[PDB]
Every structure is written in C-alpha cells, then in structure tokens.
Amino acid sequence: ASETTPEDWKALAADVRSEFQWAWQGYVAKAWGKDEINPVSGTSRSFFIEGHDLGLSLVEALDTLWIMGLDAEFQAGVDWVKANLSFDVDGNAQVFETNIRLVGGLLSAHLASGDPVLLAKARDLADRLAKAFEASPHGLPWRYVNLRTGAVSDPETNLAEIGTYLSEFGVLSQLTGERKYFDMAKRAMRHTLDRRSKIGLMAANIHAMTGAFTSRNASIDVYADSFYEYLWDAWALFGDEDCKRWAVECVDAQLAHQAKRYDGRLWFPMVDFETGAVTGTAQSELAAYYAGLLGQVGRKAQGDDYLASFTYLQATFGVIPESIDVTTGQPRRKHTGLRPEYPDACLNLWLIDRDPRYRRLAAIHYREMKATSRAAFGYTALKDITTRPMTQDDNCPGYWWSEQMKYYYLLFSDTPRIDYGQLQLSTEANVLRGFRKV
C-alpha cells in the first residue's frame, strides 16, 4: 500500500563526506606526499616515475575536499603543494596522464582558492609537456617526455593521448592571456578530424611523426573516448564553433555506423573506419562515459538507452565487469580498477532535467562500492568479482580521489559551494567552471 521510505539525500551526502574524510586520514597516516595508497597493506606506490613521487592522490583530492567543506584538509594539501611540489625532475612522464591528473588537479584547486602559486605550478608543468608537441612536425604529442630535459619517447599514440588537452590548456590560456596553449591543443585535434573517412570516422591509433593512422579500428572506447568529450567541452567552456560542429558530426557518425543491438541492448563495438564492418566484440566499463556525452550533445534518448546497458550489468554482476563480450553479455576479466564511469554518466544526464532516477541508480553504485571495496586504510580495486565475497587487490587509484566521491556528493548534496548551471568537469572530474565563493 504505502511507499517504501524516500531516500534522505542530504543524509546520504553527509555519509559520502564522512567516508571521504576517513579515507583522507588513511592517506595522511600511510602515504603522505606519495602518489597512491595501497589501503589493504597500508603502504604506498609511485605512479609517474618509480622512486620520485609527485603527490598524485593529494593533488587529485584537492577540489573534492573544497567542494565538501573539508577546509582544514584542503588547506593542508595546498600547503604541502606550495612547500614541496617541483617538476624539475630527470625522468619520463606520460604526457596524457600528467595533463589530466596534475595540470587539471592544480587548475581546479587554483579556481577554488584563488592561490596564484597553484596556477604558477600548473603553467610550469604545461610548458614541460609542450616540448612533446614541439617534437612533432604535425603538433601531435609524443607519449612520454623527460620533465627536465625535454627528450621524447614513443610516437605510436592514439586519439585520447593526442586529444585530451584542450580543456586544461584552454583554461590556462584564459587565465594567463597566452593563446599558445589553446592553439597547440586544438591543432592536434584538427589533424585527425581532417583525416576522417567518407563515413565520418577516425581510426583510434595515430603516429606522431608520420601523421598517419596505424590501425583501421574506429572506437568510442579506450584509446579514443575523451577526444570526443573534449570537442563538446571546448564549445561549452570557450564557445569554439569548430569544436561544436565536430562534436555533433563525430557522434552522429558513431550512431550511424557503430551503434549495434545484441540481445535487445545497445552497444558500440569497434568497426573498420572506412567500411563499417565490425572488427571487435569487446566493450570496457570505461565506455559508460559516452551515455553522458550523448545527452550533452542533444541525443538524450540514445544516452539513456546506452546507460540502460550498464544498469543491466550492475543489476546482474553487482560491480560492472571491467570488460565484456557484447555478443554474450559475459565478463572477459574478473578484476576491476575501482572505476568511476557509471556515476560520471549519471551526474551528466541528471544535470539536464534533475530526474530523480539518476540519483537512485548512483545510490546503488555508492552502496555497492561500500559493500565490496572498503579496506583497513581506504578503498581498493578488486581481484575477482565472481567470488562471494568478492576478493580484493591492494590499490586506491589516483582518479578515485577526483571522480566518483565527487560525483556522488554533487548528485546528493545540492551544495551552495557550486553553481550547478555553470558547472563544467574535465575527463578527470576537475571542476573548471562553477565554484561559488564562500
């Protein structure tokens, strides 16, 4: 007869904040200044350069701490950065990961606080990454660069690793007045878009020196994914008319040639970029970001249909498998990366009309994370989703500190610290617009 008791969303937001503060205390105790905590053993690891940590998880956490009103914790992290974080290091850093995690994490912390030193450090790092773009006659970045010397390595790259810079670099250009950052990021994206096939698709794999594709596989998934996000995000952040056009053209080519149904559910397998023949049967969990991008570009019904494929994986397996075979619906791997893309899609679709269904689905995902990944000193990736209980690995990935706890808190809290109508998030969930003073 009566309804089951309605969710108290403010109480659930307070629980997310409590858990985030508890995890931060574990990082301070076991991994202070180090890149990642291993929260089962209570130890740390490096991410970018073995033996030369750069405070990765501390930097990733900063904007999340501020949004939650964890102000003492935020200021302790900012003060560590200002005293300790140098990028004058004789070692190789992966250009893509360094931009989205460290340049973006310093920019969101700068926008929250106003502190000039955080902008100075973001810009210093971007100038070291610029050497990877300058080493290509096409302006396509090499995958790795030595932060001190500018030496490059590995030009056999991909759309995500040449095309996930324009949000962070374009905000640098706005704040500093120097257009060079925006221009270098946009030039790399134009290169691959100019090489689209007659059916409107790009292959995912590209060589920085020849400028030619090195496979025939078009993908929406890993090695391509965030290129398509950053086309739309550059329209939203900068008003760039080329990027607005390109975002819509690329998505409608993918809907025409990659959207396929298997057992009644929508998937986007890999296809030959010229002929449209299917070339893969795998889909990763990370492809769930695309449900939210579909809604952003004006394809909400199709975005909700794709989200439903992942909702069915969550209801069936509890945790979404890291990879599935689309022809059967069954897992290709048993381990996970404590991945954030399902609540990413839920937040992006919820920002359109505030439909409470997206809150219900994200609450299932948060509660499942608490039931499976909680460890002695924080939250961990999984070894095997098929055992009962699910067995645990021993690592908290840096992106956990920027992404899913922020997504849950934004969905549940209605915080006055954010202007929800102006909110813009990077592919690492760094807030690049929408802070309100308080």
Ligand X SMILES: OC[C@H]1NC[C@@H](O)[C@@H](O)[C@@H]1O
**Binding-site residue ranges for Ca(2+):** 229, 427
CB distance 192 to 215 below 8 Å: no
Whose Cβ is closer to Ca ion: residue 221's or residue 229's?
A: 229
* Long-range contacts from 234-237, C-beta under 8 angstroms, 24+ separation: 234/166, 234/167, 234/170, 234/186, 236/296, 236/424, 237/167, 237/170, 237/171, 237/424, 237/432, 237/433
Number of residues that bind Ca ion (CB under 5 A): 2
- Judged by CB under 6 A, the chain residues 50 through 109 that form the site for ligand X are 100
Distance CA 102, CA 108 (A): 10
- Contacting ligand X (CB under 6 A), which of 57, 197, 226, 336? 226
> What's the DSSP call for residue 204?
S
- Judged by CB under 5 A, the chain residues 202 through 261 that form the site for Ca ion are 229
- Confirm or reject binding of residue 399 to ligand X (CB under 6 A): yes
Number of residues that bind ligand X (CB under 6 A): 8
206 forms beta bridges with 157, 213
Whose Cβ is closer to Ca ion: residue 161's or residue 229's?
A: 229
Instruction: State the DSSP H helix or E strand holding residue 371, giving kind and residue range, or none if neither.
Output: helix 356-372
Q: Provide the minimum distance between the beta carbon of 77 and Na ion in the complex, in angstroms, as a whole number.
A: 10
Whose Cβ is closer to Ca ion: residue 57's or residue 427's?
A: 427
Distance CA 60, CA 97 (A): 12
Q: Is 392 helix (H, G, I), strand (E, B) or coil?
A: strand
- Judged by CB under 6 A, the chain residues 309 through 348 that form the site for ligand X are 339-340
Q: Provide the minimum distance between the beta carbon of 244 and Ca ion in the complex, in angstroms, as a whole number.
A: 15
- Judged by CB under 6 A, the chain residues 276 through 315 that form the site for ligand X are 286
Q: Which does 402 bind (CB under 5 to 8 A by kind): ligand X, Na ion, Ca ion, none?
A: Na ion
CB distance 379 to 16 below 8 Å: no
Binding site for Na ion (CB under 5 A): 60, 63, 105, 402, 430
Q: Which does 399 bind (CB under 5 to 8 A by kind): Na ion, ligand X, Ca ion, none?
A: ligand X
* Long-range contacts from 71-77, C-beta under 8 angstroms, 24+ separation: 73/21, 73/24, 74/112, 74/113, 76/28, 77/109
Whose Cβ is closer to ligand X: residue 38's or residue 427's?
A: 427
List interacting residues with ligand X (CB under 6 A): 100, 226, 286, 339-340, 399, 427-428
List interacting residues with Ca ion (CB under 5 A): 229, 427
